[PDB]
Ligand binder design. Sequence first.
Ligand SMILES: Nc1ncnc2[nH]cnc12
Length: 287
Amino acid sequence: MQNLKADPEELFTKLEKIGKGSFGEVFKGIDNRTQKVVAIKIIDLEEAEDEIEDIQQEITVLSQCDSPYVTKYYGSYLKDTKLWIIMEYLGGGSALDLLEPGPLDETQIATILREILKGLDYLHSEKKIHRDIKAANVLLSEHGEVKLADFGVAGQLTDTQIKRNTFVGTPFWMAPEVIKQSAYDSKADIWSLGITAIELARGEPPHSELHPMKVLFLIPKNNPPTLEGNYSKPLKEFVEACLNKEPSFRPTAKELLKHKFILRNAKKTSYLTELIDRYKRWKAEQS
Ligand SMILES: Nc1ncnc2[nH]cnc12
């Protein structure tokens, strides 16, 4: 943290709570210079213990990313016993939220997948592995732009460390080599993307009704999941390409951006505003 800043309230105004993050709460805020809205993740360092390792990793990684497909980072500010991590505000909800009212259509699935793939291509080109790709960590602006979020367990490859081995992620989305703690790389995110495609198509990842400890033996043992149901052949084949138990046979993000499913079905991100509006209507009438 060679660039930690101080006195954040002199540049930002903290508003209301808009959620809970991995390490504390998330608040809406305002940049007093531009009047744009921002998101502020506030972490009580007193409370943080061994999490500090990951909190430190989260900031490092956010600070090193500059992509329209990754939540922008404004800075980290020290305040009493609190660290304020100030980020891009995205008011459209997560892709998981957007699935709550009902199924997506294939154009929406492809559009969201294309944007996630652009974010993965960026991260992977920077030798970063997200490690927690799932619909909950794909956030949308109110006009439909899609960005990856939640870098708390991200991994960084370097010239001397070409693979990672840490067990991290969310069980249902974890690649088999991550569960086995084998040496893995960005291909683990391609498996998670395949699971996320099934999640965007069906609403939930494979084995979602099982206790997570159970999936830790099911994923390495069983054949890989496939997309079942009445879905187009290119979507089913997209899922199959990602969900190969041999990582080296999974395509890269750059290769998947050329997949027939994406080319035939992805449209402008602005049309995703219809899904954002569907969620707002559904949330408003939810009893
Ligand atoms: N949880 C969140 N809600 C809104 N915008 C965000 N930007 C980063 N995390 C966010």
